[PDB]
Each structure stands twice: as structure tokens, then as C-alpha cells.
Design a protein around this ligand. Structure first.
Ligand SMILES: *CCC(=O)Nc1cc(Nc2nccc(-n3cc(CN(C)C)c(-c4ccccc4)n3)n2)c(OC)cc1N1CCOCC1
Lengths: 292, 300
């Protein structure tokens, strides 16, 4: 009952958002039957059609993705099993956090970055609590509902520069491997969208990791935050932090954001007032969540 | 804190949506600072008010309109006080309930009709608990967020715009005390509530059609009211009549209309005789969960 079974004639793709990988992502419009309203949605299309009973196992997984109830994880709203599987979800009009942090290269205060790290861990801890592994966490796979509210997408289904060493050498994906990717994601945000291990061929990443070489300390990060990232990339998967621990740790820093992130001009980049925050929420973020 | 002050440079009107005596509503675009995104909103540009009011006073009542917090009353979000008075609210693509029921005329089931009455009574009870009086409750002033969720709009717009010698004043909706002596209480809002139900039960009929508005006061003193809508059992029509009693204290309370319409909504076909009603049921949980995740994140 959480997965609406669409038909082709009650929606339509409007403009491509992203393409290549999974398939294509479109800006879309939902046209209810009998009504003259057009509701903007997002549609995920798989380019390869090849589906018979492949569609049934997709529907089985689609019901699981339709059940993720969390303010910081995206829910699958509906499916259209036409030609090529079509997934329907809410449109996040601000785009992904990678493009967002890149456009606002040096116009992002320390309160936003730390809160984003808190909100991403809450969504991941939620998934771990549901015994689900994301396998592909990355700043590109986090969406900006509003600047104060991010959500993890691409849950369902090779980012070598994002995977734990055990996932590279042995294709072992756990929740502790997701912690590794979460540590690369944090680094992506702190460096404002820099490419991890830039230029370096992905085929040689397992070699440089076995030598204990890790991503460098981002300029705006105090040692407290970089040590967090370093512990996420420990060879021993069990030594890596738990997502529940990361929620508490980053939250403490979000209480004193300037003590853990050194940003030029940070004194004039604060989180919105209650006023802007009631305004945002009343328009596009009327959903129940946790105070930031 | 609940009312955002907007500058003319961070929003722009796109297209008109509909015009009324309080003003015209436009499909708007909010451009947040330093963002490349356009956020759709709804903008009401108000018509000039009689007893022209100072911007401190208008703002002093915009804070009251921005304070209503109920799933069934629309909250004013922002304001722009310049050469005109522009109100900003959440865009409701479905429109107002009056246009909706005329438009799906003989396609609406009794379970929707009785639920809309509960929801309107719930918004009105909230406004009475807050000691607020709406003064212009009507089917045109109820907005459809989703087909299963309606909200009262335009609260407080009558008090701050006033009126000239057009007594913009909804005569065929006001209690007799309001037409005669301009008395607006919670019990006269019950009078407009009865008329609002009658508009719903008739699928958008014009009340007192053919009777000039200047003559409503007198026919009301002769005991003449609105006729029984054809789909109404005497159960519902009794409740409507009680909303039109000359003694405002004999009229039903909103707290009572909530319970009474909840009762009928649990057995909707006992109370509304609609041809073909045995195929016009509510949406499934699936279709309902879909509407909520897309447009509505905020009695069977
Ligand atoms: C970072 C890339 C990106 O997503 N940009 C983006 C996002 C959105 N809003 C949006 N709403 C709902 C769903 C999505 N979305 C994106 C993707 C693929 N991304 C994460 C790499 C998926 C997806 C889900 C499941 C499976 C596979 C893919 N869902 N995105 C935009 O709407 C405003 C616009 C943009 N971009 C703006 C500038 O660049 C092009 C589009």
C-alpha cells in the first residue's frame, strides 16, 4: 500500500536531470485522473528494457524502497512497469549536495556543513537499523530538499574512490563499509566538492590504501573533524565508528560550529533565523523531522 | 517569527489564477537569496481597503493571520507592504472547493461531501478556540490541498479591508445580525457555515439566486431559508436549518458540528442520497499515501 502502481498515461517526463549511470532521471509531471493539475515529480528510468520476471523481483525490492520512512532518506513513491522500469519519487528542487556545495564554493557556513554531516548520519543509521546497506553513499547521492534539510537517495540498485578496502578487494558490503563511504562523503563536503584522490587511477587505489595513505586534511577542518574521517577509513572494519556514534559526535560539534571548522567569513554565514526557517518549512518542508 | 517580510525583488508574479472582491490571486515564484531555484508560491494582491490602514496596523494583523496553526486553516506565510498589499501562501494547485464541486458535479461521493464538512468544522472550531472570527466563510474561501484535505482560506481579510456601500460583503452568507447591525461573532460564522454546507450539498449552486442582495435581510425576517438540497436527508438539512436560526444562541456550536458530521461520515449513505454513490468511494490507502508524499506532508 506504500507503492503506487502508475500507468504511463498519468505522468510524463518533462526534462532530463541526470543521465548515464543508472539510467536517466527526469523532471516529471503527475496528472491525476479526472483532474487538471500537474504535480512535479522525479522519474528514474532504466535504459535497458530486458524485464519479464525481472520486473517481479524489481517490484519486490520496490516495496522495500517504498517503506523507508525517515526525514533524511528518500522514499520510493511509485512505479510504472511499462517498457523500462520507471521509478517515481519526490522532486528535490535544489538538486544534489555535490553540485550544491560546488556552486556555493566559499559561501557555506560551518553550521550547514556540520548539520549536513549530522543529517546524513541519521539517514544512514536509520538504514542500518533497518538492516539495509546503501553500497553507494556519496555527495552526489544526497539531495537538497532545502539548504537546511538533506536526504540520501539512490537507495535500491563502481565508486572505487568511495568504497572501503574490503569492498574493493572482496566485494564485501556491510554497514561498516558504508561508514567508510560516509567518511569520503564528509571529505567531499568539507573540500566543497573536490574529487577524491584526484587524477589517481581508480585501479591503483587499493594499493595506496594498503600503504595507509588517506585523503588529506581539508583546509577548513580542525584536527577533531579530520580524526573522525581518519577513523572511518581504518582497515579493520570493526574499528570504524558506528553511525549512531557519528550522529552524537558531529552533533556536539554543530553546537559549537566555529570551534571545529575554520572558515573565512564564517561569522556572517549563520543558519537562517526562525523566520526564514518557518518560511521554508511552510512552503516545501511540511514534513515531521528533528530540530537541527 | 511566523511572518516573513518579503522585498519586491525576491518574488515575481507569473500568471493570474482568479479574481475576487478582496483581490486577485497569482501563481507566484519565490527566488531565495543566492539560490538558482524558483519556488512556486501563491500571491494575493489585495484591493485597497476602506478606512485606509497604516502599514503598522496591517502588519499588526498580518501577524495574527500568520499565527493560525491548524491542518484545516491556511496560514499566511509572508507579506510585501509597498504600493499594494501582497500576501504569500503555499500554492494549492487544485484550487478552491466551490470550483471543485461544480466541476466534478455528479461525480462526487457522499463520503467526500461529509468529510469536507467535518474538516471545515474543524478549522472553524480552531478559530473559535483562538477567539478569532472569520467573517467570510464560503465555499469559494475553502481551498483544496488534496481531494481528501481541504483548508479554510482568507481568514482576517474581511476585517482589514472593510467595505463601502456594498452592504465585497457576502450578504447571502451572513447571519441576520451581521447584515442588520454588523455584528460578527462565532455564532454568525455558524450561519455562514450552514450556507457553506448548502453550497457543497448542491454542488456549487448560487444561494438565493434571482433575489437581489439588498433584499436578503427582509426575506430572512419572514422565516424563509434555503431549500433542502435534493441529495440531503432531513438529518443533514435539519442541521443546516439550525445554523440559520435568528437566535444566535440557539444555533449549533462548531464543537457539535464536528461530532455530528463525523457520525454521518461513518455511515455516509444513510444521510446523503446520491445516484450511483455505490461506486464513488474514498481513495485506497495507496492513492492516499501517494497524495500525502507528493502534496501534503503536514472519518471512514
Ligand atoms: C547531483 C546530481 C543531481 O541529482 N542533480 C539534480 C537533482 C535534482 N532533484 C532530484 N529530485 C529527485 C530525485 C533526484 N535524483 C537524482 C538522481 C541521480 N543523482 C543522485 C546522481 C536520482 C536517482 C535516484 C534513484 C536511482 C538513480 C538515480 N534521483 N533529483 C534536480 O531537480 C531540481 C536537478 C538536479 N540537477 C541540477 C543541475 O544539474 C543537472 C540536474
Amino acid at each position: 500500500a506504500l507503492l503506487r502502481i502508475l500507468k504511463e498515461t498519468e505522468f510524463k517526463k518533462i526534462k532530463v536531470l541526470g543521465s548515464g549511470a543508472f539510467g536517466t532521471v527526469y523532471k516529471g509531471l503527475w496528472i491525476p485522473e479526472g483532474e487538471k493539475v500537474k504535480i512535479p515529480v522525479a522519474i528514474k528510468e532504466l535504459r535497458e528494457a530486458t524485464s519479464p520476471k525481472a520486473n517481479k523481483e524489481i517490484l519486490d525490492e520496490a516495496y522495500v524502497m517504498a517503506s523507508v520512512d525517515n526525514p533524511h532518506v528518500c522514499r520510493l513513491l511509485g512505479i510504472c512497469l511499462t517498457s523500462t522500469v520507471q521509478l517515481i519519487m519526490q522532486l528535490m528542487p535544489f538538486g544534489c549536495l555535490l553540485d550544491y556545495v560546488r556552486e556555493h564554493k566559499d559561501n557555506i557556513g560551518s553550521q550547514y556543513l556540520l548539520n549536513w554531516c549530522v543529517q546524513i548520519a541519521k539517514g544512514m543509521n536509520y538504514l542500518e537499523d533497518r538492516r539495509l546497506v546503501h553500497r553507494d553513499l556519496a555527495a552526489r547521492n544526497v539531495l537538497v530538499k532545502t539548504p537546511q534539510h538533506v536526504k540520501i537517495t539512490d537507495f535500491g540498485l563502481v565508486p572505487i574512490k568511495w568504497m572501503a578496502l574490503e569492498s574493493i578487494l572482496h566485494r564485501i558490503y556491510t554497514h561498516q563499509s558504508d561508514v567508510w563511504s560516509y567518511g569520503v562523503t564528509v571529505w567531499e563536503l568539507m573540500t566543497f566538492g573536490s574529487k577524491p584522490y584526484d587524477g589517481i587511477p581508480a585501479s591503483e587505489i587499493s594499493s595506496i590504501l594498503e600503504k595507509g595513505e588517506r585523503l588529506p586534511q581539508p583546509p577548513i577542518c580542525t584536527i577533531d573533524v579530520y580524526m573522525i574521517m581518519r577513523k572511518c577509513w581504518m582497515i579493520d572494519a570493526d574499528s570504524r565508528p558506528k553511525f549512531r556514534e557519528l550522529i552524537i559526535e558531529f552533533s556536539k560539534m554543530a553546537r559549537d560550529p566555529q570551534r571545529y571548522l575554520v572558515i573565512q567569513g564564517d561569522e556572517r554565514m549563520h543558519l537562517p533565523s526562525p523566520t526564514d526557517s518557518n518560511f521554508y518549512r511552510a512552503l516545501m518542508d511540511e514534513e515531521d523531522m528533528d530540530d537541527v
